Amino acid sequence: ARPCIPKSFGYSSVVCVCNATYCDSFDPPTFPALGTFSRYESTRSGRRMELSMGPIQANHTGTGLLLTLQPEQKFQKVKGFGGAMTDAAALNILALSPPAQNLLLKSYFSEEGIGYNIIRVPMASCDFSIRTYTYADTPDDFQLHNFSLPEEDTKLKIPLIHRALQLAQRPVSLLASPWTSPTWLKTNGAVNGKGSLKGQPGDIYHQTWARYFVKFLDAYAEHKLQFWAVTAENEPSAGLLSGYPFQCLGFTPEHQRDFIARDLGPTLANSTHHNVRLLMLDDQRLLLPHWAKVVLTDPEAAKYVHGIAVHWYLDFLAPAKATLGETHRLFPNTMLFASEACVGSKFWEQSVRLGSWDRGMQYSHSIITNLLYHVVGWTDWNLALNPEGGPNWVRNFVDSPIIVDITKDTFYKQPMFYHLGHFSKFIPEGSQRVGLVASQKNDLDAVALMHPDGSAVVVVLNRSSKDVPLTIKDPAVGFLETISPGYSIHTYLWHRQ
Amino acid sequence: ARPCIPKSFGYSSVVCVCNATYCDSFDPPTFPALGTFSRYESTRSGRRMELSMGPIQANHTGTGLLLTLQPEQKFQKVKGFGGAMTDAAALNILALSPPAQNLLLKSYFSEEGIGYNIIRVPMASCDFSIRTYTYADTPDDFQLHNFSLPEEDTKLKIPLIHRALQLAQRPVSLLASPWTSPTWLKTNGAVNGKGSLKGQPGDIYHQTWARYFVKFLDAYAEHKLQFWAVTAENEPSAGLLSGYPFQCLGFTPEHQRDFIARDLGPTLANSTHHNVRLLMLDDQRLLLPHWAKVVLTDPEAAKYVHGIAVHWYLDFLAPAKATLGETHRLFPNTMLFASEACVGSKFWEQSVRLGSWDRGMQYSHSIITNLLYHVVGWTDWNLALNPEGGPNWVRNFVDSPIIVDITKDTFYKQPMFYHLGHFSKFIPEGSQRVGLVASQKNDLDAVALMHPDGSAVVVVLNRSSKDVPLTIKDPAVGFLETISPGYSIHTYLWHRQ
Amino acid sequence: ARPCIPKSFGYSSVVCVCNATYCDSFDPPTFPALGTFSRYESTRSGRRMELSMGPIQANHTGTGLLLTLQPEQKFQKVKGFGGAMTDAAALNILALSPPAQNLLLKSYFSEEGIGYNIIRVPMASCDFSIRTYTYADTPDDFQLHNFSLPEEDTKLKIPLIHRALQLAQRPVSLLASPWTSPTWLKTNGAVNGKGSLKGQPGDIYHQTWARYFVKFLDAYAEHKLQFWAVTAENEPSAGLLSGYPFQCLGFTPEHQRDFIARDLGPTLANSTHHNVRLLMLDDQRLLLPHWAKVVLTDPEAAKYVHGIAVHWYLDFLAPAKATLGETHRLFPNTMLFASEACVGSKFWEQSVRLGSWDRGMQYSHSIITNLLYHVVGWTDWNLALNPEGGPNWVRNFVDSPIIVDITKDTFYKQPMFYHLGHFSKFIPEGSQRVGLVASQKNDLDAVALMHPDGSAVVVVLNRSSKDVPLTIKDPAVGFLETISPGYSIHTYLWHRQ
Amino acid sequence: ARPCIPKSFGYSSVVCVCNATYCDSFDPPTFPALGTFSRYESTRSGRRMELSMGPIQANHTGTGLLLTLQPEQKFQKVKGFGGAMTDAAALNILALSPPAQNLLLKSYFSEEGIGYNIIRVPMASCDFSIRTYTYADTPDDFQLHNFSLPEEDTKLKIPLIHRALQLAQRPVSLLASPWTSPTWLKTNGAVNGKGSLKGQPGDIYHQTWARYFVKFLDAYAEHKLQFWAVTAENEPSAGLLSGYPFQCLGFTPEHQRDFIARDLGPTLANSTHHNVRLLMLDDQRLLLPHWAKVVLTDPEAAKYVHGIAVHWYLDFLAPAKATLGETHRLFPNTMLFASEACVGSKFWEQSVRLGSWDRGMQYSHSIITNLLYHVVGWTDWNLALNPEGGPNWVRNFVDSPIIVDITKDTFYKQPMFYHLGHFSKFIPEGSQRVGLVASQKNDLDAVALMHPDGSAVVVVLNRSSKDVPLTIKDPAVGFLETISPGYSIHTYLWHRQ
Ligand SMILES: *[C@@H]1O[C@H](CO)[C@@H](O)[C@H](O)[C@H]1NC(C)=O
Numbered sequence A, B, C, D: 001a002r003p004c005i006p007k008s009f010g011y012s013s014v015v016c017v018c019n020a021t022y023c024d025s026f027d028p029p030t031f032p033a034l035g036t037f038s039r040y041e042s043t044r045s046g047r048r049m050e051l052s053m054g055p056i057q058a059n060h061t062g063t064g065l066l067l068t069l070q071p072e073q074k075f076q077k078v079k080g081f082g083g084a085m086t087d088a089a090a091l092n093i094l095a096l097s098p099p100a101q102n103l104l105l106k107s108y109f110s111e112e113g114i115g116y117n118i119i120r121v122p123m124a125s126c127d128f129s130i131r132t133y134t135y136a137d138t139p140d141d142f143q144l145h146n147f148s149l150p151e152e153d154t155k156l157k158i159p160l161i162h163r164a165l166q167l168a169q170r171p172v173s174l175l176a177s178p179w180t181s182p183t184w185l186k187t188n189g190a191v192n193g194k195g196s197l198k199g200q201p202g203d204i205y206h207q208t209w210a211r212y213f214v215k216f217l218d219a220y221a222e223h224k225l226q227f228w229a230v231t232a233e234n235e236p237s238a239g240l241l242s243g244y245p246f247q248c249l250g251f252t253p254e255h256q257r258d259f260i261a262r263d264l265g266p267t268l269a270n271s272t273h274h275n276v277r278l279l280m281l282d283d284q285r286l287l288l289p290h291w292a293k294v295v296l297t298d299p300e301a302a303k304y305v306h307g308i309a310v311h312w313y314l315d316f317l318a319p320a321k322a323t324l325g326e327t328h329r330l331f332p333n334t335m336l337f338a339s340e341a342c343v344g345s346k347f348w349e350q351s352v353r354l355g356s357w358d359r360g361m362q363y364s365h366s367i368i369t370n371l372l373y374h375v376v377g378w379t380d381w382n383l384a385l386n387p388e389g390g391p392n393w394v395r396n397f398v399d400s401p402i403i404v405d406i407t408k409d410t411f412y413k414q415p416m417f418y419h420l421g422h423f424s425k426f427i428p429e430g431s432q433r434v435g436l437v438a439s440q441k442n443d444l445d446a447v448a449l450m451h452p453d454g455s456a457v458v459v460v461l462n463r464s465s466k467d468v469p470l471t472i473k474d475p476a477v478g479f480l481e482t483i484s485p486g487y488s489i490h491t492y493l494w495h496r497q
């Protein structure tokens, strides 16, 4: 285990500086002895997932805030946590020297880092690309004779993905999403702008597009990568907007329904890759519950949909009950999954603010809200970006948890990285969210889950300046007496056994 | 043989549209009897290298500007003209269907095109690459047992160079230039930023860097490609600026001097590639004559140096006479060559302006000035780019004479292409610049050369809006009465006996 | 009446050009007998509030969509429509020659224009100012003896307001809103950023801030201007955001509640301006119903609150029903008013797009939705801006219905101007929204209101490209057969007896 | 004194943090006792104009670097040092609270700060404005009846200038420069773009423009401000450029000559402001000596020109002797003055790099070069900018020595501020540059001057990483034994008395 090397860039908190020979890391995980609890703490003042242990006590008196575990109120099971291997992310990582590359990948994927188990993979180019390309740019190639993976896949994304999986203990799940089809499949004949697939679901354009998903999976399988899921389209609402500046493909919910029922569903089902799941929407949660109803109340589309993917832009405000809550109500057996999140918009400030505690707080707050409304996973955007928040061919720069400084052969772990890690490190696939009731109103954000083995995990975030004394009660074991300092985040772990 | 198909994109002139089945081209060269001239004319208004013929007459009917050929005043011999096969150019060309690829290469390299006879080849990655790599990225490999060419060379660059040479009637000269060394030879262990070679001339690193040149030449020789020349480093002055964003290797003039004297010269001489020439500088002309004095005043460096390579980018900072003229005067036996003949984009303009007559004029004006100041040859930068000026892993700043639309299997030949061809097509290797005396002050840019066979060539560029009546006198033949239209460029050719 | 003189700037529609001697305008309003209707029509194709008349007859010949007036279903009464006299608007208007100023003011405020009857007036500086100032910048002046109006008020805003009121036949209501207090009343001692009032409700700082409102009203009353209403703070939620770039003053909903209960309410009540109304929130609708619940469920605050002001900017984040509808349901006797009825340029678009039909449609669509969810009035943002969307001391981000070119003594009336006028001109204060039942699902946006005198008004917006045949039934008069052209807005008016 | 409060933003050095109650400052200046020298030192490691004193010794032996004062080799006399009161500068300063504004203005203008005695004042708007305006925007107002100063002058620039002069003990010289004329005086009718004055020198457009200079001066005199000098036009070469993005007015050198001879010269001479001097050029030194020859070899223009104003963009490197030295040689009696300098540019790093030691070094290196080539004064660009390098209406952001953070009511003094102050504080108006010979080639930049009272000043900049032991010999007094630490700058002062 090595501790953070802090560096300030003049914002509210510090980054942790890594290079070819040094990066902060954890010792291997160990469970806390029965009758005791583990606490990991990060603070704006500079603590970074610092470990301590305390006793679980038999008794508690006093009128302080009490959060009581409700182990018999069981909600969703967790799919996992990760981020996106974009062209930008892969280019920045591979521009580091090999030992630094490995310390970066370890940070995210190893048990000695934060245990990511999801990687989102763009199907060809997006805004976080240095050029526009699809896998089938030969005009009118309906048989997809000229489908192929460029160097961006074979030389950047794919070798990094293999390395990530080799470092991970846990099985990693790959999720793919397209931004645009070939331009010759599109009404507007351009990668961006307003335009959808030509023709009507059922037809040659829609069939070719569905077979393009299959060719993609085939090509990745040639390189020994298999996918857990695909989305129907990244942000289908974007292709409905005039002058949309980067790669998109428009679908109304009805077009999405009919494409899935007529084309994508049957095509994937008839392929060797029929086990790959399909997620719909892959867009802002403001489009729910409407989009889910349109798609999922058609049994011919419904039978092909495993889940509903949501995005959020963190610089904007919620509210989750009406969108996430209502969708779960209507379709409780169709998982909700957060497939993309990012910060920076935003407007008076930079795309990358090195050391922003506030941006970290946005991540963990969003993650708790999502977990409180049935969401089974949360996936960050770009795994790594440069200090400008790119590259991005359209200059649509945003922040990332890891910022690579190629000229210095170094990378900075932002507070966002640790805010993410407080969840990803401590909530394996299979974990189930359970009840946690506050004895009184409070300023804390908290969530409780139980590991597949039975043990408990609680994350508590304090976005206020005031320290908050608190007790967590688990009837199986007793009381954890603790304090949540202002501008901190804690994860608590204990056996119930 | 086939005329330009014009298209406007809102700029001052048109591009010529080419695709898989059509591109503008020339008939094989054919020139008239003594007393007749051939004129090729391009105009902002849309003419593109249009041919006409007329008389050279015994009597003088013009009363305006006279330009008199003076074949007895003889200056430099021409090496030739070309452009760079960057990874970006190769990626763009290879994104066309094979028939379109061939029309693109014929446009540049055939006699039915503009007859390039020089190709500059980066040694591994530069900014116009989609990733960072070198030929020996495995560290501590001081004998370079692990030196190898990646796909960029073996799949993209080499095959296209082979195809270029097959199309050219004239022999093509290859010129190589490295941007960065393996980062384990560098002070800063990065591809970019402030950093030079580790240690000092003569040491293990400097000898390893020199051996890399030979390794490069060996590798290319295995692919049946031989080099005319190499430069000592691309823009060595860039690797001295902190945070320099592109691949670089810094050298002060004294470090270049000693590396040449102690390592590169001896190593090259000791190889089977001892015939390959060595050019120094390869940087902005503002660094002259200083850089030339530092290096060429040292006999142990100068015996290994064939010429001085210059870049045009910052030409606006330093006038030709004080730089090019003065260097020639001090070292009249060391040739000057423009190795990156790509001039500076205005800060508020896009990288690519399809159909910009201004950018074309800037090329021809700068070729004329260079010819008037002793320069023997030109390599343009990227032979082709996409409509964004890419791909470039850092940022697009520059235009290119051919722009490829990889969604429409089409490419566009810019005014730059035709301004370049007004020289490259009509000035073969071994042509000699001769005197051309203006009878009075004027605003045209003009230059005269004599082909090896004794025939004359004169280029006349009118950067003004106003038509200029013109007479050209050959004392051996008579008077050519003509008009240089506003915003035009003409190339006149004639037999002298 | 003088017709629109159209000009295109490359966007989907035209602007109307006005200058010192010419501007489009309407005849005095004149309406026909029972059995006849009047129709004003604007189209993307270029029609601008063009008038025609036709029959309402006994026989129903349409077989398509039917919209039936239901005058017995009665909803909210309208306060009115207007825009904001920012420093920027006043600077822009005052840069015209006096005859041009007058045509611009008549365009907005006369019956020969679009009949605005509301002006919102910033209390001191906001982003649309050329400098930061407040009315009491001299520190520790707790009795506000140094409170004064600068030239922005006395030379720019106030004479323009006087001229507006003199031009209007309808009584004009003034609404004031502050952005920041004097920085010495603030926790952070700055005009912007994260900061609130010092101390706690009831103290000297809070009392001084309340007194500032009264001092403002006194000052304006000295210039013979009286206010209809004030808002408690412009965008209180902005001043809780670290680094917020514009003038701001943060209030959580409880702090607003308590400031109103403890200070603002009692101070206004104790003054000679006790009749001026107080509106809460003045912020995004995503903050409702919560904000309304916090403030309005406290009788000590709620007794002082006349209505709830909303901004449209972030409307896309939260549907009308859940915010406006639910707030109405919970607090049906507290009026909803849109105090900054403005959006909100897509992140990749210019602040000003001269002739954008889309931006016009957004205004009319959002007026219609507001009217359908109980909203009683609208103030647009800046009355006029320059072509850069300025002046703004931070950053230009929004368009305006009138754009002034200060170099040509001209102003341009945008499609937004006409989409506003289709409501403002034909819905006087006291008009009541009534039912209008669609016979079948359709894509038009429509709303019916009844004038105080009992005559009918119906606005129909067609946001689609397709013509929609339409009948409108008035049970008292008969059937109006019409067509709503694609990309059109119509206002229909008729007598009902 | 109060010492610097250092803050790092991650760059090579620290900024000094000032706010309403604290700013670093000097004690009143005092003369070093005879037989002693004063030294002020700034270093990248963090020293900021730190004062020490040592002995002047009677001899010296050991052959390290010796700099010998040559007090009888006398060159130019110094006019002064200062910077630009742009709209951007003034809006930033006035957005700080009043006590912080005074500390900022003391930093620059007081003897307890760095002693600026020049302020450059734009005549109306430039790129560092938040809107475009001129003083006479009424079309075809040839009598300039509607000439007036807007708030940018009467409320921001003019009050700050008054306060600057009150703080200064040295007399301050004001310098005015226009960027554009009224658009109706211009061939292109727009504030930016390619365009010059309509008509021909002598005519009404040229006479009105000359009279505009006099009306500007009259209006400033109404406010009790007088000018030392005006320039003929900011950057005349910029208006010759198609698409130039911001305010400009093109003049060829011939046009400038003829405008001065026919219009500006006689008009100023005939006014009450005839004592105001006129500087020509006000543009990049690359335009010299050609522009000087064109203007100054015409006695009808020459009689009106007091000096030549030059600009530099410090991220570029022209040579100086060819430009400055040659112009001095041709026109030794026409002073050379540097009227604007700025850094960044450097696309790949930001406009503002808080704490950049490299950018400070660019300033001091430029000032020494200028002083070594006859230049009598050096004037920075914007006195203060925000952290983005604005406001700038065209987003042409750049760095500034003082960076205002309005949200924190604080300002940061950059290394540039100190590098400038090593000259401005210690080289009063009247100081004459004298000889200083190095005993051996070295990497130091050094310059020697004598104060009006006879005392000596020497600045030494070390841009290398290596400490350099150094002796300075003054025959009147002896030897100063010192060291120039790597990445330092020192000013040495001593009486010779
Ligand atoms: C990498 O970081 C470690 C720990 O801070 C440091 O001691 C070491 O020198 C660094 N290596 C570099 C900068 O090459």
Ligand SMILES: *[C@@H]1O[C@H](CO)[C@@H](O)[C@H](O)[C@H]1NC(C)=O
Binding pocket: B005, B018, B019, B020, B021, B022
């Ligand atoms: C290629 O260009 C030629 C000449 O314009 C044209 O006739 C042909 O249709 C083009 N090919 C395609 C597929 O557009």
Ligand SMILES: *[C@@H]1O[C@H](CO)[C@@H](O)[C@H](O)[C@H]1NC(C)=O
Binding pocket: C005, C018, C019, C020, C021, C022
């Ligand atoms: C004002 O506009 C009217 C209507 O287009 C036009 O006839 C008149 O010439 C305009 N005035 C000027 C000075 O352009």
Ligand SMILES: *[C@@H]1O[C@H](CO)[C@@H](O)[C@H](O)[C@H]1NC(C)=O
Binding pocket: D005, D018, D019, D020, D021, D022
């Ligand atoms: C101003 O600066 C000094 C830092 O040296 C500090 O002691 C003081 O608290 C600061 N004041 C404010 C208001 O931040």
